[PDB]
Design an enzyme around this catalytic site. Sequence first.
Site, PDB file in Angstrom:
ATOM      1  N   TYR A 162      65.201  86.608  29.429  1.00  0.00           N
ATOM      2  CA  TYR A 162      65.531  87.872  28.797  1.00  0.00           C
ATOM      3  C   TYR A 162      65.104  88.951  29.774  1.00  0.00           C
ATOM      4  CZ  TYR A 162      65.568  85.458  24.195  1.00  0.00           C
ATOM      5  OH  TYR A 162      65.808  84.612  23.126  1.00  0.00           O
ATOM      6  N   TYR A 198      66.092  77.792  26.176  1.00  0.00           N
ATOM      7  CA  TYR A 198      65.043  77.926  27.183  1.00  0.00           C
ATOM      8  C   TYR A 198      63.784  77.284  26.653  1.00  0.00           C
ATOM      9  CZ  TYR A 198      63.970  81.788  24.019  1.00  0.00           C
ATOM     10  OH  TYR A 198      63.712  82.534  22.886  1.00  0.00           O
ATOM     11  N   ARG A 219      63.980  75.711  22.938  1.00  0.00           N
ATOM     12  CA  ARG A 219      64.662  76.392  21.851  1.00  0.00           C
ATOM     13  C   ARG A 219      66.157  76.293  22.116  1.00  0.00           C
ATOM     14  NH1 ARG A 219      63.246  81.852  19.299  1.00  0.00           N
ATOM     15  NH2 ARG A 219      64.058  80.444  17.660  1.00  0.00           N
ATOM     16  N   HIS A 222      70.476  80.890  21.253  1.00  0.00           N
ATOM     17  CA  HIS A 222      70.562  81.770  20.094  1.00  0.00           C
ATOM     18  C   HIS A 222      70.589  83.248  20.467  1.00  0.00           C
ATOM     19  CE1 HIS A 222      66.438  81.458  21.327  1.00  0.00           C
ATOM     20  NE2 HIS A 222      66.256  82.650  20.789  1.00  0.00           N
ATOM     21  N   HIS A 224      69.308  87.062  18.980  1.00  0.00           N
ATOM     22  CA  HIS A 224      68.422  87.772  18.060  1.00  0.00           C
ATOM     23  C   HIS A 224      69.049  89.018  17.412  1.00  0.00           C
ATOM     24  CE1 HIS A 224      64.733  85.517  19.073  1.00  0.00           C
ATOM     25  NE2 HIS A 224      65.235  85.453  20.294  1.00  0.00           N
TER      26      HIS A 224
HETATM   27 FE   LIG Z   1      64.716  84.072  21.700  1.00  0.00          FE
HETATM   28 HG   LIG Z   2      58.765  77.419  24.576  1.00  0.00          HG
END
Ligand SMILES: [Fe+3]
Ligand SMILES: [Hg+2]
Lengths: 309, 309
Positions: A162, A198, A219, A222, A224
């Site tokens: 990010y 990630y 994860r 996705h 947010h």
């Molecule tokens: Fe996230």
């Molecule tokens: Hg993690």
Amino acid sequence: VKIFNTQDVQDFLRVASGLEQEGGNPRVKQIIHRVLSDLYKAIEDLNITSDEYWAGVAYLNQLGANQEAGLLSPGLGFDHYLDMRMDAEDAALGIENATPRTIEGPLYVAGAPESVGYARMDDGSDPNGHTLILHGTIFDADGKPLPNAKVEIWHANTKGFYSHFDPTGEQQAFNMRRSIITDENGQYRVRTILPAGYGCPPEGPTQQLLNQLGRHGNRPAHIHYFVSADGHRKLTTQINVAGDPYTYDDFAYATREGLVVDAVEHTDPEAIKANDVEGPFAEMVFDLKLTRLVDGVDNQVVDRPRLAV
Amino acid sequence: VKIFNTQDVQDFLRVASGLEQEGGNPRVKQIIHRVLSDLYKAIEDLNITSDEYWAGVAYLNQLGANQEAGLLSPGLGFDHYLDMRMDAEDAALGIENATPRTIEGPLYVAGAPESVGYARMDDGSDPNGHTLILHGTIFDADGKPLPNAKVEIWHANTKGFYSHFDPTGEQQAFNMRRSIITDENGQYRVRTILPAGYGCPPEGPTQQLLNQLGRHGNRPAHIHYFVSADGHRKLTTQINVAGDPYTYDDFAYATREGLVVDAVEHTDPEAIKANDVEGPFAEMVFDLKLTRLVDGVDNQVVDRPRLAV
Ligand SMILES: [Fe+3]
Ligand SMILES: [Hg+2]
Ligand SMILES: CCCCCCCCCCCCCCC(=O)OC[C@H](COP(=O)(O)OCC[N+](C)(C)C)OC(=O)CCCCCCCCC
Ligand SMILES: CCCCCCCCCCCCCCC(=O)OC[C@H](COP(=O)(O)OCC[N+](C)(C)C)OC(=O)CCCCCCCCC
Ligand SMILES: [Fe+3]
Ligand SMILES: [Hg+2]
Ligand SMILES: [Hg+2]
Ligand SMILES: [Hg+2]
Ligand SMILES: [Hg+2]
Ligand SMILES: [Hg+2]
């Protein structure tokens, strides 16, 4: 060895918590006392050695030094546990909140640029980025389109980073982060790229602990969301990209039915020209329905430290 | 609203802990499972809000960022509690501890200069420094003087700062830190200066949490000891300088009966000469009695991260 239940240990716990002191915050002392007690007891029940204890103290320093407390938190299920509590409370108040909430994650950054109805979210610096047209409608508590709602979106690139938390430093400010004010039909539309899942910093304390529990720190891909509007409670949720290997095995346990969305692939020329994109692209549609304030107040908004730029 | 004892949450704790997971360290899972259970429950019992929770997570990051976990630990009584468990275990084994143990503290540093029988610990870089002649006898488990015993001593200067942990950074490595091997008569003798008590970094997380408990973070002037010898268990203790305001109000609760020592002030020219000092000095005598290994084992020596230079 059993000394936890003696008077010395019990009195000591009261002293250490400052329950005897006249100054301080009574609420903090209340919590500390409870936590020290449970730990002093856990140390006895599990016969934790000094060696084990100090290994735990050292781990604690590493966690903070690496600013990973907010990453370990969701991995040990707290973030989701707090959501579960929030759901239980709404269910008790007859709040049939249509769009399920889920965890916020520690990567929100305040201050992203905002625009009405539409906005391109990426700077196109991701070589492997696959164009994604994400759009939907925001409905109020009554099921009616809600213009003027503020949709905040943030996601990672194909490398799983990010902006503002990219270990490789690359990214431009607020890349893949935008605030969209819904239009006349209560709609939002953005052009960005498909995020990749990630994991935890491979050599960080969070991953260290996870290995000890025989777990992974990955994860699923996705996006947010933050949705706020007058007369309604702020919605914190996210959407999972269908087909991800970790869709239902998210290390943060954020996934929920109703939040897994299908990214429809388009390659035919008519679709490409229509959405004035430059080649094959993916499309996701996601509508969000908000809940009404509870007796004039947002009983579930969370105030936590978030990075601001 | 209560969900802790429902199936969903109980099964969730087992999953987050890696209990049904095949890989990993079951000892860690066991402890993690216990800790998580207690924390999830404490959150519900004390009705901790997300706002409160996230402030706690923020505190953990700064606690580690400041490398203060080892400082808060003793301030919350863990260090002493562990000493109590050790005493209790020694009692159960019938071991009479002549010289009581007490907390090590987070400021020990390995690699100090070594010498036989005598050692001057300071380098004179402390202006307000008052000459202290600390000496004593080390006795084996049979009350007889023990030669070749390794006495390790470390303490702060008059500003209450330790070498390697001095913010002003004006101390040379191992200043006021020495290892002394006892002489033919099992004695150790050092020339140094009277340490000053000290508190928590005023701006640090330990200090701020203490404020919320209405507690202070000061310790009375003291001197740390590590004493080891073949056939004997390693002794960890410290002596308190008698008369210090915080002698019985130490934030680390390390004070113990038998460890408080009187600094005798010598002003007679005859004593100043016999002791090779340039003037008025203070003298402290402290003998320590070691305990023998238990079947070739030191059942209480602690392996913890210690700065080594
Ligand atoms: Fe996230
Ligand atoms: Hg993690
Ligand atoms: C100020 C308040 C202080 C509170 C302290 C917290 C309570 C104390 C409980 C901690 C218990 C930890 C016991 C874990 C343990 O005994 O060893 C943990 C592992 C080690 O792996 P090994 O392979 O055994 O290492 C050795 C390899 N050799 C043999 C080859 C050298 O290392 C790790 O970092 C995992 C540690 C995770 C524990 C953190 C819990 C915090 C979550 C909230
Ligand atoms: C990785 C998993 C993490 C598990 C952690 C679970 C613990 C959750 C319990 C958290 C309890 C904290 C709640 C206390 C609180 O609500 O605020 C704490 C204080 C703040 O001061 P206030 O004046 O109230 O701020 C308000 C000023 N206003 C009124 C003007 C706005 O600040 C502090 O640092 C005190 C926090 C110390 C707690 C650390 C305990 C750890 C030791 C074992
Ligand atoms: Fe000390
Ligand atoms: Hg759940
Ligand atoms: Hg990871
Ligand atoms: Hg005690
Ligand atoms: Hg202090
Ligand atoms: Hg302190």
